[PDB]
Design an enzyme around this catalytic site. Structure first.
Site, PDB file in Angstrom:
ATOM      1  N   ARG B 201     -14.569   1.147   4.075  1.00  0.00           N
ATOM      2  CA  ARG B 201     -15.995   1.289   3.858  1.00  0.00           C
ATOM      3  C   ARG B 201     -16.505  -0.163   3.663  1.00  0.00           C
ATOM      4  O   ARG B 201     -17.620  -0.515   4.047  1.00  0.00           O
ATOM      5  CB  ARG B 201     -16.291   2.148   2.632  1.00  0.00           C
ATOM      6  CG  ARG B 201     -15.996   3.628   2.823  1.00  0.00           C
ATOM      7  CD  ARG B 201     -16.189   4.410   1.506  1.00  0.00           C
ATOM      8  NE  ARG B 201     -15.133   4.052   0.559  1.00  0.00           N
ATOM      9  CZ  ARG B 201     -15.102   4.424  -0.715  1.00  0.00           C
ATOM     10  NH1 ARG B 201     -16.080   5.181  -1.216  1.00  0.00           N
ATOM     11  NH2 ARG B 201     -14.097   4.019  -1.490  1.00  0.00           N
ATOM     12  N   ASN B 202     -15.672  -1.002   3.075  1.00  0.00           N
ATOM     13  CA  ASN B 202     -16.054  -2.412   2.834  1.00  0.00           C
ATOM     14  C   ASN B 202     -15.947  -3.195   4.153  1.00  0.00           C
ATOM     15  O   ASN B 202     -15.290  -2.773   5.095  1.00  0.00           O
ATOM     16  CB  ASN B 202     -15.008  -3.124   1.936  1.00  0.00           C
ATOM     17  CG  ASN B 202     -15.049  -2.695   0.468  1.00  0.00           C
ATOM     18  OD1 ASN B 202     -14.006  -2.701  -0.228  1.00  0.00           O
ATOM     19  ND2 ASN B 202     -16.227  -2.353  -0.020  1.00  0.00           N
ATOM     20  N   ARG B 296      -1.701   0.882  -0.778  1.00  0.00           N
ATOM     21  CA  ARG B 296      -1.632   1.322  -2.186  1.00  0.00           C
ATOM     22  C   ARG B 296      -2.889   2.010  -2.684  1.00  0.00           C
ATOM     23  O   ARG B 296      -4.030   1.600  -2.378  1.00  0.00           O
ATOM     24  CB  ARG B 296      -1.336   0.097  -3.077  1.00  0.00           C
ATOM     25  CG  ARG B 296      -0.021  -0.566  -2.708  1.00  0.00           C
ATOM     26  CD  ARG B 296       0.038  -1.971  -3.253  1.00  0.00           C
ATOM     27  NE  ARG B 296       0.202  -1.996  -4.690  1.00  0.00           N
ATOM     28  CZ  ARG B 296       1.274  -2.514  -5.305  1.00  0.00           C
ATOM     29  NH1 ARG B 296       2.285  -3.052  -4.623  1.00  0.00           N
ATOM     30  NH2 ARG B 296       1.324  -2.484  -6.621  1.00  0.00           N
ATOM     31  N   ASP B 297      -2.667   3.066  -3.473  1.00  0.00           N
ATOM     32  CA  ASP B 297      -3.712   3.853  -4.112  1.00  0.00           C
ATOM     33  C   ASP B 297      -4.758   4.317  -3.135  1.00  0.00           C
ATOM     34  O   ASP B 297      -5.937   4.350  -3.430  1.00  0.00           O
ATOM     35  CB  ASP B 297      -4.377   3.102  -5.246  1.00  0.00           C
ATOM     36  CG  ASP B 297      -5.090   4.070  -6.251  1.00  0.00           C
ATOM     37  OD1 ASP B 297      -4.823   5.337  -6.384  1.00  0.00           O
ATOM     38  OD2 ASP B 297      -5.951   3.524  -6.943  1.00  0.00           O
TER      39      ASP B 297
END
Ligand SMILES: [Br-]
Ligand SMILES: [Br-]
Ligand SMILES: [Br-]
Ligand SMILES: [Br-]
Ligand SMILES: [Br-]
Ligand SMILES: [Br-]
Ligand SMILES: [Br-]
Ligand SMILES: [Br-]
Ligand SMILES: [Br-]
Ligand SMILES: [Br-]
Ligand SMILES: [Br-]
Ligand SMILES: [Br-]
Ligand SMILES: [Br-]
Ligand SMILES: [Br-]
Ligand SMILES: [Br-]
Ligand SMILES: [Br-]
Lengths: 396, 396
Positions: B201-202, B296-297
């Site tokens: 999204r970034n 990650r995450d």
């Protein structure tokens, strides 16, 4: 990539910033409004999508007359046809100068654009006649484009517009419709530099498939953009899902890897022949193409235009240096018995008549309609399958 | 190309035939209707666009419980999360079984889809709790996704739907939004076979740019599809025009010819971490990707999930043979002083700590916000220009 016409960057009128878009959509619903003509709506969509860059809105009579008489606007810039918003009257808006333009082609007549009116002018008969004759090269009301142009009223509303959506062109064809902005982006994603554009509404049989391949080879183009004119279904038309599938299948099976994009745009055809061909080159340059194919009687109707007039207009009427895009002049294709391939007959001056076999697109579709496969020189089986599967569902 | 999940061809619910589309839109305006939740709307858009193929509409409680407990529907097919249409009550529709679903996210609440109701069920607390705990791995109402799931009511309306548009996701981002159908078409137009997908999204700084390039190299992929989650602007967010430009510039300047497509889709993020990562793989396979990057995450929020849990769920919870897409397991990148390039630290076990230099995406944006250019190892000047030109217009 090739520059846009008349500016360094495209200037689409669609409101790309979502926050400003929501703000305008909200304001629009409270503004005095009017349902514009289908022609004016298509003009707005083309301006909203960047195809008519750098136009900022609807032309006043001086600019429309300049486009018609000299393809030149009051600021000296090049533009080949009038881009007007003609109404029968201004009852609906009275004296308001900021109004919403509503879409005649979507049920409910939703807002399509917001406009700041800079002038309201009455077009005289003389002026309407010059705009008709110069663009359509006839004032005959039996020419459908002439009739359409002259059936919207005579009140020209001019001024800048901001466009809120792409009407039914994107809503009905979400996978095919593209703005000029995104076709430029996709051309870059493909890594293409020289790109040849081809317009079609019909599915592409082998003849036009081969024309695109010939042009790509002779121009050393990196890819072809098939740019379909999207519109409402008319009597006898092949539904878009079928037409789209036929063209995508041709691209997938017969073109080399990374050489074809299938896309579409929304506008109402003018059937103006030569001058419309110049408009087609203009917006193909704005979408990123370096070359545009123009064959016989391009954009014509009836018996109004000479076969190659839409090519020669670029030699004798388009102002010098108007555009950077180049035209690829096409002509009839045929199977050459001597070379055992599809060629444009004009490219092989040594052949005799008995050396060619021709089958028109019309005759190919007539056979397909009867469940008959044309010869492989004229019809690709995978494409024919799609079209015959369709025809047998309605002609049996 | 890679097959869709659970069928040989995608089964989007959007009404592609224009004639039938107009017919349904017209009928819809006369039907009893209800404004659904933003979650249900995003579910409908994903089904309309082919991302959730082959689902035919909203699930009943038995299927939703099966997706939650075993990622398996009542017919034995694989699907990782419930796809529900939960309402507070059915006052708005009474006993009608054919209704229009209206969009909560577009002013005026336009019709988004037409639905044939096959069942109306009340979800019990026990059932809501199993669906929440199994999908989100917590029942904590401070987890925003858990709260959202549990704030739509308990009446589950199930049955097949036909989708009329793609809500604000296409209307606001006409050049970026794509259906799974069209991303497959574009992948073929590019001539790509193996394709790795990356969600963001970034805007992408050099770290994620390099991750995509590393994955493409190690997988011998033909291209990368950057697949952005499109949505409403939130406090602090970078506007889409800027974000889009930053990513397109990175693609245009730093990736090899014909290796990246920039696209987007519309759905409301669940913030479910591991199970959402499985859903992400599912719809990336439907759009044509052979590989999907999970770092990650992934899809996490707060402190609910372990760093690599969204990777290991594929080893210990996803049923064997559920999907054909493969996961590319990512990890932290850094500049290696020894190799003078960006690497994933886990790929070079010989290095020491002093051998790496790290700068997080968050720290990069913080510097950009102050008009400070991060080092070239972390920020491409052309991308930084776009973001700083933006930040200086609001942070000065
Ligand atoms: Br531009
Ligand atoms: Br009209
Ligand atoms: Br479409
Ligand atoms: Br070149
Ligand atoms: Br045409
Ligand atoms: Br159609
Ligand atoms: Br021709
Ligand atoms: Br054919
Ligand atoms: Br498919
Ligand atoms: Br919601
Ligand atoms: Br966009
Ligand atoms: Br391969
Ligand atoms: Br993300
Ligand atoms: Br935004
Ligand atoms: Br990571
Ligand atoms: Br950056």
């Amino acid at each position: 990539m090739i520059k846009p016409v008349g500016s360094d960057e495209l200037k689409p009128l669609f409101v790309y910033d979502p926050e400003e878009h929501h703000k305008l959509s909200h304001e629009a619903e409270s503004l005095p409004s009017v349902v514009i003509s289908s022609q004016a709506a298509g003009n707005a969509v083309m301006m909203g999508a960047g195809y008519f860059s750098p136009l900022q809105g609807f032309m006043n009579v001086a600019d429309a007359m300049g486009a018609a008489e000299k393809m030149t606007l009051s600021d000296g810039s090049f533009f080949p046809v009038p881009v007007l918003c003609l109404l029968e009257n201004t009852d609906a808006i009275g004296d308001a100068k900021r109004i919403a333009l509503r879409d005649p082609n979507v049920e409910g007549n939703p807002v399509l654009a917001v406009m700041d009116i800079e002038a309201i002018e009455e077009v005289s008969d003389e002026q309407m006649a010059v705009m008709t004759d110069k663009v359509y090269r006839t004032t005959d009301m039996d020419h459908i484009g002439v009739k359409t142009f002259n059936s919207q009223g005579r009140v020209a509303v001019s001024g800048p517009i901001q466009v809120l959506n792409f009407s039914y062109f994107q809503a009905d064809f979400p996978d095919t419709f593209r703005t000029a902005v995104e076709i430029r982006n996709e051309i870059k994603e493909h890594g293409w530099s020289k790109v040849v554009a081809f317009q079609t509404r019909n599915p592409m049989h082998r003849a036009h498939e081969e024309l695109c391949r010939m042009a790509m080879e002779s121009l050393d183009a990196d890819g072809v953009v098939v740019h379909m004119l999207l519109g409402k279904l008319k009597k006898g038309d092949i539904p878009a899902p079928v037409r789209d599938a036929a063209i995508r299948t041709m691209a997938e099976v017969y073109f080399p890897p990374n050489t074809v994009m299938v896309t579409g745009y929304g506008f109402d055809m003018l059937y103006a022949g030569p001058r419309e061909a110049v408009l087609h080159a203009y917006f193909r340059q704005n979408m990123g193409a370096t070359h545009f194919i123009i064959g016989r009687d391009h954009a014509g109707v009836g018996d109004y235009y000479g076969a190659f007039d839409a090519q020669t207009i670029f030699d004798d009427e388009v102002p010098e240096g108007a555009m950077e895009i180049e035209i690829f002049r096409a002509d009839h294709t045929a199977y050459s018995k001597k070379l055992n391939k599809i060629v444009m007959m004009r490219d092989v001056p040594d052949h005799t008549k008995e050396d060619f076999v021709l089958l028109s697109g019309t005759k190919v579709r007539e056979m397909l309609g009867q469940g008959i496969a044309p010869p492989p020189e004229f019809s690709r089986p995978e494409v024919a399958k799609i079209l015959m599967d369709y025809y047998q569902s309605i002609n049996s």
